[PDB]
Write a protein that binds this ligand. Structure first.
Ligand SMILES: OC[C@H]1O[C@H](O[C@H]2[C@H](O)[C@@H](O)[C@@H](O[C@H]3[C@H](O)[C@@H](O)[C@@H](O[C@H]4[C@H](O)[C@@H](O)[C@@H](O[C@H]5[C@H](O)[C@@H](O)[C@@H](O[C@H]6[C@H](O)[C@@H](O)[C@@H](O[C@H]7[C@H](O)[C@@H](O)[C@@H](O[C@H]8[C@H](O)[C@@H](O)[C@@H](O[C@H]9[C@H](O)[C@@H](O)[C@@H](O[C@H]%10[C@H](O)[C@@H](O)[C@@H](O[C@H]%11[C@H](O)[C@@H](O)[C@@H](O[C@H]%12[C@H](O)[C@@H](O)[C@@H](O)O[C@@H]%12CO)O[C@@H]%11CO)O[C@@H]%10CO)O[C@@H]9CO)O[C@@H]8CO)O[C@@H]7CO)O[C@@H]6CO)O[C@@H]5CO)O[C@@H]4CO)O[C@@H]3CO)O[C@@H]2CO)[C@H](O)[C@@H](O)[C@@H]1O
Ligand SMILES: OC[C@H]1O[C@H](O[C@H]2[C@H](O)[C@@H](O)[C@@H](O[C@H]3[C@H](O)[C@@H](O)[C@@H](O[C@H]4[C@H](O)[C@@H](O)[C@@H](O)O[C@@H]4CO)O[C@@H]3CO)O[C@@H]2CO)[C@H](O)[C@@H](O)[C@@H]1O
Length: 678
């Protein structure tokens, strides 16, 4: 009847009807799950019943295949002959078999290959990888690099034991988005252990508190960046085994880092031999993971789309969430492609002006929203400290409100509008024509009842035609002009300064959390290019040149040190988790932005050349102000013009204006945060 979200946003009651239906569809589905499955928590334990599971004296294999008329389990254990391992179908379309132990040992050995062999209506037999397989390996020797499902039940001598607890939820997420495969300096696919031993310390040393782990779910197409999942329960085998990933998560927890995983429940790869799409043999949507016809196909991604209303699809996805959380001790997730799930048009060729009828209509996908609400309720009841992030460009209201208020249940939203604004400024505007108004409004125009994670550039700003901000600033000059033993050219000084500036203002003004993609913290040059036919499958641009930031006589160390000190500043002052956000000056003629966040006063000089001596900045309490972070510091690649022990005494006003003010030196292209001395 009445939802609490209506009190947060009166404009929502106009669409009560919509929400009514939506909430009804939620409460019914949950109710059904509680009546016939024992509740969401038990429903999400489906990976203990489906797939291959060892019990006392036998092994149970279950697989949902309504379209099959006959089915058997084949593998190395029966030399790919399922004659003595025929499965039986029930009224729900589920095939099952119990296989007794052989000489006291399980019938299917650990680390052996298995396949689900079934005959469909036409009369032909096909072999597929089990949908709930937990490991799948490819053989690059054979043509196709075809995958094989692998039964993963390691003995205690090689099963990883988690030794460290989950860290507490931070006051604000400082997220290091990473991809294990391209995390090494060698032009190859790196391993989970190499990432845990080499990269995680870099993340902790730069004072991040969260890692966003991409490309964990298995995907046969490496260049998909993990977005085209084939085996949803399998840890991507190109970087190691599931135990290696468990070791990665445990090591991150030992360093005090929280780990989120990329969850791709928005679509599925079209790969029929290796992936889930192989269970589509033409059956109707009520016997399939996916919709049929147009609704079952994503035109932009060339992918299959789930039928979120199906009982078995709900079991599949909710159990996938519980599987990742429980078996790998993840601290939360980022749901990718949420915009495509929210609307029947998937936002493919549609811009969202903000008109509420574009959010709440019959273009709204109620099945997917019901699934996401069930998912968020389940995940927050399993782990109240979990952080669930939604990757959504539309800005759907109440998307990040709890389920019990009428919301979708996400904790944070990705603030996906800032990067393109920065790109436009860098590409088509001269430095003296940059609008401070548009920058401030882009950083601050958001729904303040819902939390958001700001970032100047993510992984997508490194791929498919996008360059890093550092490269957009300096380009080929980075190849030759980044040595610390020679004076930096004007271009290099400009680029380093503006990179620090863009990152810092996006963090301090753009939301309630920060995200940075692996390598951009030190201005990694160029772009990311995956191995493909066009480059003869080169890994040259599918890696991270840690050499550049580690070398003392180069200048990347400056951007890295500024990133580290900026994260440490956020840790000490907690300005990302403070609602006090006052922009007290926006000098468009002088290109200066003065604002207040937390207990800090931020002065940004975006002017190309002019220094402002004795610039007056507003502040609340009178007293003694000093530099907390200054981008012109020599250790950050500046010229050291500001000076850190200088006392900025306040003077009351009258001898956006504030009670008191103090005067600062503001060199061009600089950012200084000031704190009040106790
Ligand atoms: O303590 C004590 C100590 O001791 C010791 O030490 C010592 C020692 O011993 C001694 O020796 C000394 O040292 C010293 C020395 O001597 C000196 O020399 C120095 O050195 C230094 C330096 O200085 C610095 O700088 C550094 O360096 C570095 C750097 O930094 C970095 O960077 C690196 O580099 C590198 C890189 O990385 C790489 O890469 C390479 O590069 C290369 C490349 O590759 C190639 O290619 C080339 O390039 C080139 C080209 O070719 C051409 O062409 C050009 O280009 C251009 C073009 O033409 C134009 O056109 C433009 O382009 C553009 C376009 O237009 C657009 O389109 C875009 O693009 C695009 C692209 O194309 C693509 O990629 C896209 O995408 C794609 C996708 O992905 C797919 O999928 C498909 O779709 O396709 C697509 C495509 O279509 O993307 C994009 C878009 O987004 O854009 C573009 C661009 O913008 O433009 C361009 C430009 O750029 O040109 C180029 C260039 O020129 O070549 C290159 C080369 O150059 O390699 C490099 C190198 O070189 O690394 C480096 C090295 O490291 O460092 C150094 C060293 O350090 O100093 C020193 C000192 O400091 O002394 C010492 C002390 O004592 C012991 O040892 C120690 O330990 C101890 O401690
Ligand atoms: O009704 C109360 C029951 O609630 C729960 O049952 C679930 C099943 O577990 C789900 O599997 C599903 O059943 C679907 C099934 O997924 C789907 O394939 C379809 O079955 C086909 C079958 O494959 C085909 O071979 C043919 O012969 O029969 C059906 C024709 O389409 O439809 C089934 C019904 O939806 O959903 C139900 C709930 O709706 C719970 O698990 C049970 O314990 C409980 O009895």
């Amino acid at each position: 009847d009445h939802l609490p979200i209506y009190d947060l946003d009166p404009k929502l009651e106009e669409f009560k009807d919509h929400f009514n239906y939506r909430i009804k569809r939620y409460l019914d589905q949950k109710c059904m799950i509680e009546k016939h499955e024992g509740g969401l928590e038990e429903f999400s334990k489906g990976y203990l019943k489906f797939g291959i599971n060892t019990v006392d004296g036998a092994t149970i294999y279950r697989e949902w295949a309504p379209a099959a008329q006959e089915a058997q389990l084949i593998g190395e254990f029966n030399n790919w002959n399922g004659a003595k391992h025929k499965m039986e179908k029930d009224k729900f379309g589920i095939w099952s078999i119990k296989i007794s132990h052989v000489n006291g040992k399980p019938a299917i050995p650990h680390n052996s290959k298995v396949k689900f062999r079934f005959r469909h209506g036409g009369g032909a037999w096909v072999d597929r990888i089990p949908a709930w397989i937990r490991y799948a390996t490819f053989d690059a020797s054979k043509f196709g690099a075809p995958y094989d499902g692998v039964h993963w039940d390691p003995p205690a001598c090689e099963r990883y034991v988690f030794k460290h607890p989950r860290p507490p939820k931070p006051d604000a997420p400082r997220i290091y988005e990473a991809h294990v495969g391209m995390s090494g300096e060698e032009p190859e696919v790196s391993t989970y252990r190499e990432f845990a031993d080499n990269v995680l310390p870099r993340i902790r040393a730069n004072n991040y508190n969260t890692v966003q782990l991409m490309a964990i779910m298995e995907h046969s197409y490496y260049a998909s960046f993990g977005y085209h999942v084939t085996n949803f329960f399998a840890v991507s085998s190109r970087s190691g085994t599931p135990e290696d990933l468990k070791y990665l998560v445990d090591k991150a927890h030992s360093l005090g880092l929280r780990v989120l995983m990329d969850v791709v429940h928005s679509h599925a790869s079209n790969n029929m031999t290796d992936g889930l799409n192989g269970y589509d043999v033409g059956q109707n949507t009520h016997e399939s993971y996916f919709h049929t016809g147009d609704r079952g196909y994503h035109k932009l991604w060339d992918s299959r789309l789930f039928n979120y209303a199906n009982w078995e699809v709900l079991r599949f996805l909710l159990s996938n969430l519980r599987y990742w959380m429980d078996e790998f001790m993840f601290d939360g997730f980022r749901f990718d492609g949420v915009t495509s799930m929210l609307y029947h048009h998937h936002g493919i060729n549609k811009g969202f002006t903000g008109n509420y009828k574009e959010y709440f209509s019959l273009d709204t996908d109620v099945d997917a929203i019901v699934y996401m609400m069930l998912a968020n309720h389940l995940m927050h009841k399993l782990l109240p400290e979990a952080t669930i992030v939604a990757e959504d460009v539309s800005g759907m209201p109440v998307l990040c409100r709890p389920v019990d208020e009428g919301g979708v249940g996400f904790d944070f939203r990705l603030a996906m509008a800032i990067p393109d604004r920065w790109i436009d400024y860098l590409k088509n505007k001269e430095d003296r024509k940059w609008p401070m108004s548009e920058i401030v409004q882009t950083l601050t125009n958001r729904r303040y009842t819902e939390k958001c994670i700001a970032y100047a550039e993510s992984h997508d700003q490194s791929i498919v035609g996008d360059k890093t901000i550092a490269f957009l600033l300096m380009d080929k000059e980075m190849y030759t002009g980044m040595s610390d033993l020679q004076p930096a050219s004007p271009t290099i000084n400009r680029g380093i300064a503006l990179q620090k500036m863009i990152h810092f203002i996006t963090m301090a003004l753009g939301g309630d959390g920060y995200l940075n993609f692996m390598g951009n913290e030190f201005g990694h040059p160029e772009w990311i290019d995956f191995p493909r036919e066009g480059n003869n499958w080169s890994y040259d641009k599918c890696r991270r040149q840690w050499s550049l930031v580690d070398t003392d006589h180069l200048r990347y160390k400056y951007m890295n040190a500024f990133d580290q000190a900026m994260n440490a500043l956020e840790e000490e002052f907690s300005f990302l988790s403070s609602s006090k956000q006052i922009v007290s000056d926006m000098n468009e003629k002088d290109k200066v932005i003065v604002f207040e966040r937390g207990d800090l006063v931020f002065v940004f000089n975006f002017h190309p050349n002019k220094t402002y001596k004795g610039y007056k900045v507003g502040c609340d309490l009178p007293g003694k102000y000093r530099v907390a972070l200054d981008s012109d510091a020599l250790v950050f690649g500046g010229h050291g013009r500001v000076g850190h022990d200088v006392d900025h005494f306040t003077s009351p006003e009258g001898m956006n204006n504030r009670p008191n003010s103090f005067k600062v030196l503001s060199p061009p292209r600089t950012c200084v945060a000031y704190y009040r001395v106790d």
